[PDB]
Amino acid sequence: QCVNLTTRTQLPPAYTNSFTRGVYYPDKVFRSSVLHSTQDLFLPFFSNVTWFHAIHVTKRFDNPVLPFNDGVYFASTEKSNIIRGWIFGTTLDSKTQSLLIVNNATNVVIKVCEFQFCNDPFLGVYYHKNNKSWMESEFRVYSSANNCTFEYVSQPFLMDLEGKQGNFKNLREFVFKNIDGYFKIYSKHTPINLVRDLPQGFSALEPLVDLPIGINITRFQTLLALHRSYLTPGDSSSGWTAGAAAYYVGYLQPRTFLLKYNENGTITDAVDCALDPLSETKCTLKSFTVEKGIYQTS
Amino acid sequence: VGYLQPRTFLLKYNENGTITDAVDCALDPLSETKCTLKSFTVEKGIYQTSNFRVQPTESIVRFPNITNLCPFGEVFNATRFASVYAWNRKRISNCVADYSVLYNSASFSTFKCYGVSPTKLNDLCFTNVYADSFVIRGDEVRQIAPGQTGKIADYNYKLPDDFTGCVIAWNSNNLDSKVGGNYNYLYRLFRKSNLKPFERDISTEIYQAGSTPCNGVEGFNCYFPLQSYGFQPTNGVGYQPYRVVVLSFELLHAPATVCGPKKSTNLVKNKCVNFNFNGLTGTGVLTESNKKFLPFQQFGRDIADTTDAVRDPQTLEILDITPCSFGGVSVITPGTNTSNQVAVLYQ
Amino acid sequence: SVLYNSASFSTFKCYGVSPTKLNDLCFTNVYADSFVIRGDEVRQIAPGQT
Amino acid sequence: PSKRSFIEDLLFNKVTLADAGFIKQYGDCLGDIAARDLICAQKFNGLTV
Amino acid sequence: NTLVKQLSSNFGAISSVLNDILSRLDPPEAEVQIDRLITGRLQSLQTYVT
Ligand SMILES: *[C@@H]1O[C@H](CO)[C@@H](O[C@@H]2O[C@H](CO)[C@@H](O)[C@H](O)[C@H]2NC(C)=O)[C@H](O)[C@H]1NC(C)=O
Ligand SMILES: *[C@@H]1O[C@H](CO)[C@@H](O[C@@H]2O[C@H](CO)[C@@H](O)[C@H](O)[C@H]2NC(C)=O)[C@H](O)[C@H]1NC(C)=O
Ligand SMILES: *[C@@H]1O[C@H](CO)[C@@H](O[C@@H]2O[C@H](CO)[C@@H](O)[C@H](O)[C@H]2NC(C)=O)[C@H](O)[C@H]1NC(C)=O
Ligand SMILES: *[C@@H]1O[C@H](CO)[C@@H](O[C@@H]2O[C@H](CO)[C@@H](O)[C@H](O)[C@H]2NC(C)=O)[C@H](O)[C@H]1NC(C)=O
Ligand SMILES: *[C@@H]1O[C@H](CO)[C@@H](O[C@@H]2O[C@H](CO)[C@@H](O)[C@H](O)[C@H]2NC(C)=O)[C@H](O)[C@H]1NC(C)=O
Ligand SMILES: *[C@@H]1O[C@H](CO)[C@@H](O)[C@H](O)[C@H]1NC(C)=O
Ligand SMILES: *[C@@H]1O[C@H](CO)[C@@H](O)[C@H](O)[C@H]1NC(C)=O
Ligand SMILES: *[C@@H]1O[C@H](CO)[C@@H](O)[C@H](O)[C@H]1NC(C)=O
Ligand SMILES: *[C@@H]1O[C@H](CO)[C@@H](O)[C@H](O)[C@H]1NC(C)=O
Ligand SMILES: *[C@@H]1O[C@H](CO)[C@@H](O)[C@H](O)[C@H]1NC(C)=O
Ligand SMILES: *[C@@H]1O[C@H](CO)[C@@H](O)[C@H](O)[C@H]1NC(C)=O
């Protein structure tokens, strides 16, 4: 059954800046101690990303349906496993086919079917006071799924689910692409210690999976989780708190990048060759250092 | 009795057309300078000949440990095939691709390969192998090719422009024709836009041919998009059923698991040896390497883009590859008129 | 595409143009030639044939 | 050792040649050293000084 | 060093690596690709000498 969440304050959208984020390995060949140029779909440097909250304090349980233009950079700052998955599709209403990638308390589930998704999909964690324990109670995502072409279920695990109190401790970065019937996923995990704002730094994402789904993705929507206790009084549509979490969305464009490989084979730096004229001379000289002078660019 | 070898010779023809003299261009450095100057006489001096070359002694093959044969029997010998609009895709892995087992039971009217020669299939290893299956009319088989038009290639099944793999098709009148008429197989006839490559559309919504929306009622200028083939034993060959399999794969970039039939040898090091690693062939000297590959990579390449490191598919150890031809050579001659004695300098 | 639902062609080959560009072009001096032949002889309707 | 004047010794230390010496043996660059050192990368492709 | 770097150009061939072409292609089809590479690399040597 589907429930429309109420008691959620509406706020204007927030934006921030990506500081040389979203670089991934273009191919699967080992290289070391080299500057290598490659043209592909990247997140441009110093771009303007959108920012979304799950902060109780306002509630602000954000989960809009967003565009999927040419691929998505998705970043997530968490400490309590709130962000649980995504749904990708065109209409999301059982007339067409949709992709579900969800992490339920025990398994990772990837399905391609004709879903009647809920208007407000979510997952539910309930907390018992008498014995301190958090367990998953609700799975309210879709009404029916009929014609399934692709399915995958991962091996069983036990997740933590406990609400934490410190600042954000985990950054999880994903890149999603859809090319010639393949849905491609790159990812990387990083330890952080911060409270707000996407952090600085550089880290290349590695290939994770390549799914042969064969559908026309145009939009997507994030799947989050809820907390309920004895301090959350009400019915289904009003008795719920949030739990802090944040996520950031950016869009990829075709660009030429100059990537740097150290002597161990890891990408440690990059130049966006179409950001600035300075970057263009860096790209032409094939170096990260420019000597004093005047250069013709283009 | 003597035995012939492939050589380059410089032959001399006199003014009557008879061969009166010859130079064997690979006997000596002196002969090499004779061959280069294209004369039988060399003046006094020092000449650069060619870098010092080493010929390989052994040949080695290193393929992964695979024992099972690929499922040719539930791909090419399935009891029921899919309709072209809802076409089937199947993963293939961890199996030897020995297709000569198909010789004694199957005959293919169509078999065409893109991005690879059919005579190299036995020596290669294949990455990300998939098999697509469907049934079409006989006339429509020419449309299963890159850059084609027609209703199959626009609404049902589309290939990429850059396609690596093979297309295989055979007549199936005995299996898929019924005396009354076999209406199990369907195809899409109306669509707003063309499909993208390797895209599957399985919706059944009333197609609006003109204005005046349909409200899903199927009236005038409002159609049901899917239509049925009528397959009967007495049709012309153009209208008979055909079973089609499309094989899609990748070559020589990432680790592979299919790997056609070829026996592996032992790994020999520190000698110039012809080598085959997962279908990639070359010559050189193999040494132990300190490089550490991430689990998803198989080959290492340098600035000139040539492969200089490889993970062994058996022992999973990284190996460096080095050319075995190196070093400059020169020859000193007092003049062929004076003498045939020469000196050689190795730089 | 109005021919899709009524006609099936065993042979269809285009010279000097790609079949995927036909929908975006305008054509000058169009003529249609029609005849009937034996099935074996269809391969001869091509440039440089004997 | 070199019978050079003081000024010639100073001058010769201000220009750095790309390679000192002309005997680089095959065993000297085998494996990793190749394709890292630029001189051996040149010599494995037929380019000699 | 520029001559060494110019060995990664395809010159309009499938790859710039000879060993990659020689596997996966038979002599009659490998010849046209090898011919493209040969023309490109002779042009590079000529530019250097000039
Ligand atoms: C949540 O609200 C949505 C409206 O956004 C409800 O969806 C509507 O349901 C009615 C009756 O089934 C339809 O007539 C409307 O067309 C629907 N609107 C949309 C936008 O789909 C939904 O039923 C509500 N969920 C509940 C009450 O559980
Ligand atoms: C990032 O993108 C947003 C959305 O386009 C920009 O927000 C707009 O900014 C202009 C100028 O300040 C305003 O006139 C618009 O009304 C804003 N739109 C919205 C929806 O708020 C934003 O300026 C961009 N850059 C930064 C640094 O935020
Ligand atoms: C998470 O999802 C998986 C797969 O959807 C669930 O595992 C299935 O559970 C049902 C109900 O007992 C079984 O009939 C299936 O055989 C299970 N499939 C497996 C194990 O592959 C799992 O129960 C879900 N977890 C939670 C907490 O709901
Ligand atoms: C998609 O689902 C629909 C709905 O079930 C399927 O249509 C029905 O399939 C059953 C199964 O054989 C038939 O008995 C019905 O006659 C079909 N039509 C209706 C109106 O129920 C459809 O086959 C499915 N499509 C695919 C590609 O699996
Ligand atoms: C993929 O899906 C999108 C959205 O359903 C299709 O784009 C729409 O096409 C219709 C006409 O067919 C237009 O009226 C809409 O404005 C388009 N919307 C968008 C967001 O582009 C697209 O045609 C589909 N692609 C394929 C190959 O079927
Ligand atoms: C106590 O914990 C167990 C497992 O965590 C749970 O099943 C049980 O319901 C809890 N007690 C009550 C009264 O809910
Ligand atoms: C490279 O690998 C070595 C050996 O593991 C390690 O000590 C070093 O920190 C790594 N990183 C760099 C930049 O050398
Ligand atoms: C060539 O032919 C002429 C005429 O027959 C003959 O006299 C001469 O001996 C032949 N040989 C040479 C080397 O000229
Ligand atoms: C295909 O399956 C049929 C079913 O019995 C069998 O008779 C035939 O020999 C099979 N052909 C093969 C395995 O090539
Ligand atoms: C393959 O065979 C080799 C030698 O027979 C053995 O060492 C290795 O463990 C086997 N398995 C794999 C996965 O390499
Ligand atoms: C061709 O003409 C016949 C004559 O009646 C007609 O039945 C058939 O539908 C026509 N086919 C077309 C117009 O595609």
PDB file of N, CA, C and O in Angstrom, chain B residues 75-121:
ATOM      1  N   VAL B  75      20.939 -23.088 -26.988  1.00  0.00           N
ATOM      2  CA  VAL B  75      20.914 -21.879 -27.777  1.00  0.00           C
ATOM      3  C   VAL B  75      20.457 -22.182 -29.190  1.00  0.00           C
ATOM      4  O   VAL B  75      19.498 -21.591 -29.678  1.00  0.00           O
ATOM      5  N   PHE B  76      21.120 -23.122 -29.861  1.00  0.00           N
ATOM      6  CA  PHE B  76      20.750 -23.440 -31.226  1.00  0.00           C
ATOM      7  C   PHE B  76      19.715 -24.542 -31.327  1.00  0.00           C
ATOM      8  O   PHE B  76      19.182 -24.766 -32.412  1.00  0.00           O
ATOM      9  N   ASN B  77      19.394 -25.219 -30.240  1.00  0.00           N
ATOM     10  CA  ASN B  77      18.458 -26.329 -30.305  1.00  0.00           C
ATOM     11  C   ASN B  77      17.345 -26.174 -29.274  1.00  0.00           C
ATOM     12  O   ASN B  77      16.870 -27.151 -28.698  1.00  0.00           O
ATOM     13  N   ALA B  78      16.913 -24.944 -29.026  1.00  0.00           N
ATOM     14  CA  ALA B  78      15.797 -24.688 -28.126  1.00  0.00           C
ATOM     15  C   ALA B  78      14.461 -25.049 -28.767  1.00  0.00           C
ATOM     16  O   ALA B  78      14.263 -24.907 -29.973  1.00  0.00           O
ATOM     17  N   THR B  79      13.528 -25.515 -27.938  1.00  0.00           N
ATOM     18  CA  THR B  79      12.230 -25.957 -28.438  1.00  0.00           C
ATOM     19  C   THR B  79      11.311 -24.801 -28.819  1.00  0.00           C
ATOM     20  O   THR B  79      10.466 -24.956 -29.706  1.00  0.00           O
ATOM     21  N   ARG B  80      11.436 -23.654 -28.160  1.00  0.00           N
ATOM     22  CA  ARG B  80      10.601 -22.494 -28.440  1.00  0.00           C
ATOM     23  C   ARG B  80      11.480 -21.255 -28.471  1.00  0.00           C
ATOM     24  O   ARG B  80      12.275 -21.042 -27.554  1.00  0.00           O
ATOM     25  N   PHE B  81      11.349 -20.452 -29.518  1.00  0.00           N
ATOM     26  CA  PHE B  81      12.038 -19.176 -29.639  1.00  0.00           C
ATOM     27  C   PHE B  81      11.096 -18.032 -29.279  1.00  0.00           C
ATOM     28  O   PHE B  81       9.885 -18.208 -29.159  1.00  0.00           O
ATOM     29  N   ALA B  82      11.670 -16.855 -29.076  1.00  0.00           N
ATOM     30  CA  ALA B  82      10.907 -15.677 -28.697  1.00  0.00           C
ATOM     31  C   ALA B  82      10.412 -14.919 -29.919  1.00  0.00           C
ATOM     32  O   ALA B  82      10.868 -15.128 -31.040  1.00  0.00           O
ATOM     33  N   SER B  83       9.442 -14.041 -29.691  1.00  0.00           N
ATOM     34  CA  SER B  83       9.012 -13.110 -30.717  1.00  0.00           C
ATOM     35  C   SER B  83      10.017 -11.975 -30.849  1.00  0.00           C
ATOM     36  O   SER B  83      10.713 -11.627 -29.901  1.00  0.00           O
ATOM     37  N   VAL B  84      10.094 -11.399 -32.046  1.00  0.00           N
ATOM     38  CA  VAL B  84      11.137 -10.418 -32.319  1.00  0.00           C
ATOM     39  C   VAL B  84      10.953  -9.142 -31.505  1.00  0.00           C
ATOM     40  O   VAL B  84      11.925  -8.438 -31.234  1.00  0.00           O
ATOM     41  N   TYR B  85       9.725  -8.796 -31.127  1.00  0.00           N
ATOM     42  CA  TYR B  85       9.535  -7.567 -30.369  1.00  0.00           C
ATOM     43  C   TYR B  85      10.012  -7.729 -28.925  1.00  0.00           C
ATOM     44  O   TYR B  85      10.616  -6.814 -28.361  1.00  0.00           O
ATOM     45  N   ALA B  86       9.736  -8.872 -28.306  1.00  0.00           N
ATOM     46  CA  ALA B  86      10.279  -9.218 -26.993  1.00  0.00           C
ATOM     47  C   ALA B  86      11.435 -10.216 -27.096  1.00  0.00           C
ATOM     48  O   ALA B  86      11.373 -11.313 -26.559  1.00  0.00           O
ATOM     49  N   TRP B  87      12.517  -9.815 -27.752  1.00  0.00           N
ATOM     50  CA  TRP B  87      13.621 -10.721 -28.058  1.00  0.00           C
ATOM     51  C   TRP B  87      14.389 -11.146 -26.809  1.00  0.00           C
ATOM     52  O   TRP B  87      14.394 -10.460 -25.791  1.00  0.00           O
ATOM     53  N   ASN B  88      15.036 -12.306 -26.885  1.00  0.00           N
ATOM     54  CA  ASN B  88      15.694 -12.867 -25.711  1.00  0.00           C
ATOM     55  C   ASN B  88      17.197 -12.601 -25.699  1.00  0.00           C
ATOM     56  O   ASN B  88      17.846 -12.669 -26.739  1.00  0.00           O
ATOM     57  N   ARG B  89      17.752 -12.370 -24.500  1.00  0.00           N
ATOM     58  CA  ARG B  89      19.178 -12.146 -24.271  1.00  0.00           C
ATOM     59  C   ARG B  89      19.698 -13.087 -23.186  1.00  0.00           C
ATOM     60  O   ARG B  89      19.103 -13.175 -22.112  1.00  0.00           O
ATOM     61  N   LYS B  90      20.797 -13.795 -23.464  1.00  0.00           N
ATOM     62  CA  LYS B  90      21.350 -14.788 -22.546  1.00  0.00           C
ATOM     63  C   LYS B  90      22.849 -14.605 -22.346  1.00  0.00           C
ATOM     64  O   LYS B  90      23.600 -14.537 -23.319  1.00  0.00           O
ATOM     65  N   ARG B  91      23.273 -14.580 -21.087  1.00  0.00           N
ATOM     66  CA  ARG B  91      24.682 -14.517 -20.715  1.00  0.00           C
ATOM     67  C   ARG B  91      25.394 -15.850 -20.942  1.00  0.00           C
ATOM     68  O   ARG B  91      24.859 -16.918 -20.648  1.00  0.00           O
ATOM     69  N   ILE B  92      26.632 -15.784 -21.413  1.00  0.00           N
ATOM     70  CA  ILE B  92      27.460 -16.961 -21.634  1.00  0.00           C
ATOM     71  C   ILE B  92      28.817 -16.741 -20.983  1.00  0.00           C
ATOM     72  O   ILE B  92      29.445 -15.701 -21.195  1.00  0.00           O
ATOM     73  N   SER B  93      29.258 -17.698 -20.167  1.00  0.00           N
ATOM     74  CA  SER B  93      30.545 -17.563 -19.504  1.00  0.00           C
ATOM     75  C   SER B  93      31.084 -18.926 -19.096  1.00  0.00           C
ATOM     76  O   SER B  93      30.333 -19.890 -18.946  1.00  0.00           O
ATOM     77  N   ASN B  94      32.412 -18.975 -18.902  1.00  0.00           N
ATOM     78  CA  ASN B  94      33.131 -20.111 -18.306  1.00  0.00           C
ATOM     79  C   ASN B  94      33.008 -21.399 -19.116  1.00  0.00           C
ATOM     80  O   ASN B  94      32.781 -22.475 -18.568  1.00  0.00           O
ATOM     81  N   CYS B  95      33.189 -21.298 -20.426  1.00  0.00           N
ATOM     82  CA  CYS B  95      32.946 -22.433 -21.301  1.00  0.00           C
ATOM     83  C   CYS B  95      33.837 -22.336 -22.528  1.00  0.00           C
ATOM     84  O   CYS B  95      34.176 -21.242 -22.963  1.00  0.00           O
ATOM     85  N   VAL B  96      34.271 -23.486 -23.040  1.00  0.00           N
ATOM     86  CA  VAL B  96      35.078 -23.544 -24.259  1.00  0.00           C
ATOM     87  C   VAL B  96      34.179 -23.434 -25.486  1.00  0.00           C
ATOM     88  O   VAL B  96      33.193 -24.164 -25.610  1.00  0.00           O
ATOM     89  N   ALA B  97      34.552 -22.566 -26.427  1.00  0.00           N
ATOM     90  CA  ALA B  97      33.754 -22.314 -27.634  1.00  0.00           C
ATOM     91  C   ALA B  97      34.223 -23.179 -28.809  1.00  0.00           C
ATOM     92  O   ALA B  97      34.742 -22.694 -29.810  1.00  0.00           O
ATOM     93  N   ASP B  98      34.003 -24.487 -28.686  1.00  0.00           N
ATOM     94  CA  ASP B  98      34.358 -25.448 -29.737  1.00  0.00           C
ATOM     95  C   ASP B  98      33.155 -25.713 -30.637  1.00  0.00           C
ATOM     96  O   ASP B  98      32.395 -26.653 -30.420  1.00  0.00           O
ATOM     97  N   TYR B  99      33.011 -24.921 -31.698  1.00  0.00           N
ATOM     98  CA  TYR B  99      31.791 -24.966 -32.495  1.00  0.00           C
ATOM     99  C   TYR B  99      31.760 -26.063 -33.548  1.00  0.00           C
ATOM    100  O   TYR B  99      30.725 -26.231 -34.197  1.00  0.00           O
ATOM    101  N   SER B 100      32.842 -26.807 -33.755  1.00  0.00           N
ATOM    102  CA  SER B 100      32.791 -27.896 -34.722  1.00  0.00           C
ATOM    103  C   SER B 100      31.858 -29.013 -34.285  1.00  0.00           C
ATOM    104  O   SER B 100      31.566 -29.900 -35.087  1.00  0.00           O
ATOM    105  N   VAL B 101      31.408 -29.010 -33.030  1.00  0.00           N
ATOM    106  CA  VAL B 101      30.377 -29.941 -32.599  1.00  0.00           C
ATOM    107  C   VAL B 101      29.038 -29.628 -33.245  1.00  0.00           C
ATOM    108  O   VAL B 101      28.142 -30.477 -33.241  1.00  0.00           O
ATOM    109  N   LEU B 102      28.866 -28.424 -33.790  1.00  0.00           N
ATOM    110  CA  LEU B 102      27.665 -28.082 -34.531  1.00  0.00           C
ATOM    111  C   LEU B 102      27.686 -28.598 -35.959  1.00  0.00           C
ATOM    112  O   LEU B 102      26.656 -28.517 -36.629  1.00  0.00           O
ATOM    113  N   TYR B 103      28.824 -29.098 -36.449  1.00  0.00           N
ATOM    114  CA  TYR B 103      28.935 -29.432 -37.867  1.00  0.00           C
ATOM    115  C   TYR B 103      27.980 -30.545 -38.252  1.00  0.00           C
ATOM    116  O   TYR B 103      27.333 -30.477 -39.299  1.00  0.00           O
ATOM    117  N   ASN B 104      27.876 -31.569 -37.424  1.00  0.00           N
ATOM    118  CA  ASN B 104      27.179 -32.789 -37.792  1.00  0.00           C
ATOM    119  C   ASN B 104      25.692 -32.746 -37.512  1.00  0.00           C
ATOM    120  O   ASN B 104      25.029 -33.769 -37.666  1.00  0.00           O
ATOM    121  N   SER B 105      25.154 -31.614 -37.076  1.00  0.00           N
ATOM    122  CA  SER B 105      23.724 -31.524 -36.807  1.00  0.00           C
ATOM    123  C   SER B 105      23.045 -30.266 -37.324  1.00  0.00           C
ATOM    124  O   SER B 105      21.815 -30.266 -37.431  1.00  0.00           O
ATOM    125  N   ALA B 106      23.771 -29.214 -37.680  1.00  0.00           N
ATOM    126  CA  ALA B 106      23.181 -27.924 -37.997  1.00  0.00           C
ATOM    127  C   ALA B 106      23.698 -27.406 -39.326  1.00  0.00           C
ATOM    128  O   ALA B 106      24.869 -27.599 -39.663  1.00  0.00           O
ATOM    129  N   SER B 107      22.824 -26.740 -40.076  1.00  0.00           N
ATOM    130  CA  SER B 107      23.184 -26.107 -41.337  1.00  0.00           C
ATOM    131  C   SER B 107      22.652 -24.687 -41.343  1.00  0.00           C
ATOM    132  O   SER B 107      21.453 -24.485 -41.164  1.00  0.00           O
ATOM    133  N   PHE B 108      23.523 -23.711 -41.557  1.00  0.00           N
ATOM    134  CA  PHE B 108      23.145 -22.307 -41.470  1.00  0.00           C
ATOM    135  C   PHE B 108      23.120 -21.664 -42.847  1.00  0.00           C
ATOM    136  O   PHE B 108      24.100 -21.727 -43.585  1.00  0.00           O
ATOM    137  N   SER B 109      21.993 -21.050 -43.184  1.00  0.00           N
ATOM    138  CA  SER B 109      21.898 -20.300 -44.426  1.00  0.00           C
ATOM    139  C   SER B 109      22.626 -18.965 -44.341  1.00  0.00           C
ATOM    140  O   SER B 109      23.098 -18.459 -45.361  1.00  0.00           O
ATOM    141  N   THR B 110      22.727 -18.385 -43.148  1.00  0.00           N
ATOM    142  CA  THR B 110      23.404 -17.112 -42.946  1.00  0.00           C
ATOM    143  C   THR B 110      24.367 -17.223 -41.783  1.00  0.00           C
ATOM    144  O   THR B 110      23.996 -17.723 -40.721  1.00  0.00           O
ATOM    145  N   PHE B 111      25.592 -16.748 -41.985  1.00  0.00           N
ATOM    146  CA  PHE B 111      26.570 -16.670 -40.906  1.00  0.00           C
ATOM    147  C   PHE B 111      27.581 -15.584 -41.248  1.00  0.00           C
ATOM    148  O   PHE B 111      28.419 -15.788 -42.124  1.00  0.00           O
ATOM    149  N   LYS B 112      27.513 -14.441 -40.571  1.00  0.00           N
ATOM    150  CA  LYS B 112      28.370 -13.309 -40.912  1.00  0.00           C
ATOM    151  C   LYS B 112      28.967 -12.664 -39.673  1.00  0.00           C
ATOM    152  O   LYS B 112      28.252 -12.414 -38.708  1.00  0.00           O
ATOM    153  N   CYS B 113      30.267 -12.383 -39.698  1.00  0.00           N
ATOM    154  CA  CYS B 113      30.974 -11.846 -38.541  1.00  0.00           C
ATOM    155  C   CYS B 113      31.509 -10.439 -38.794  1.00  0.00           C
ATOM    156  O   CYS B 113      31.996 -10.139 -39.882  1.00  0.00           O
ATOM    157  N   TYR B 114      31.370  -9.574 -37.794  1.00  0.00           N
ATOM    158  CA  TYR B 114      31.745  -8.166 -37.843  1.00  0.00           C
ATOM    159  C   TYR B 114      32.839  -7.896 -36.823  1.00  0.00           C
ATOM    160  O   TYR B 114      32.686  -8.232 -35.646  1.00  0.00           O
ATOM    161  N   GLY B 115      33.915  -7.255 -37.266  1.00  0.00           N
ATOM    162  CA  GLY B 115      35.027  -6.902 -36.414  1.00  0.00           C
ATOM    163  C   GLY B 115      36.045  -7.988 -36.171  1.00  0.00           C
ATOM    164  O   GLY B 115      36.958  -7.785 -35.373  1.00  0.00           O
ATOM    165  N   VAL B 116      35.913  -9.137 -36.826  1.00  0.00           N
ATOM    166  CA  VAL B 116      36.793 -10.278 -36.627  1.00  0.00           C
ATOM    167  C   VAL B 116      36.678 -11.135 -37.873  1.00  0.00           C
ATOM    168  O   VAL B 116      35.664 -11.100 -38.569  1.00  0.00           O
ATOM    169  N   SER B 117      37.750 -11.835 -38.202  1.00  0.00           N
ATOM    170  CA  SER B 117      37.764 -12.809 -39.284  1.00  0.00           C
ATOM    171  C   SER B 117      37.324 -14.180 -38.781  1.00  0.00           C
ATOM    172  O   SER B 117      37.750 -14.608 -37.714  1.00  0.00           O
ATOM    173  N   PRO B 118      36.475 -14.887 -39.530  1.00  0.00           N
ATOM    174  CA  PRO B 118      36.051 -16.230 -39.101  1.00  0.00           C
ATOM    175  C   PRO B 118      37.179 -17.237 -38.948  1.00  0.00           C
ATOM    176  O   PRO B 118      37.014 -18.218 -38.224  1.00  0.00           O
ATOM    177  N   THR B 119      38.316 -17.036 -39.596  1.00  0.00           N
ATOM    178  CA  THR B 119      39.438 -17.954 -39.446  1.00  0.00           C
ATOM    179  C   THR B 119      40.265 -17.719 -38.184  1.00  0.00           C
ATOM    180  O   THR B 119      41.152 -18.525 -37.897  1.00  0.00           O
ATOM    181  N   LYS B 120      40.011 -16.656 -37.423  1.00  0.00           N
ATOM    182  CA  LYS B 120      40.712 -16.424 -36.167  1.00  0.00           C
ATOM    183  C   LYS B 120      39.926 -16.853 -34.934  1.00  0.00           C
ATOM    184  O   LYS B 120      40.488 -16.847 -33.839  1.00  0.00           O
ATOM    185  N   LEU B 121      38.671 -17.267 -35.088  1.00  0.00           N
ATOM    186  CA  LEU B 121      37.826 -17.594 -33.943  1.00  0.00           C
ATOM    187  C   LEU B 121      38.447 -18.665 -33.050  1.00  0.00           C
ATOM    188  O   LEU B 121      38.254 -18.648 -31.830  1.00  0.00           O
TER     189      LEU B 121
END
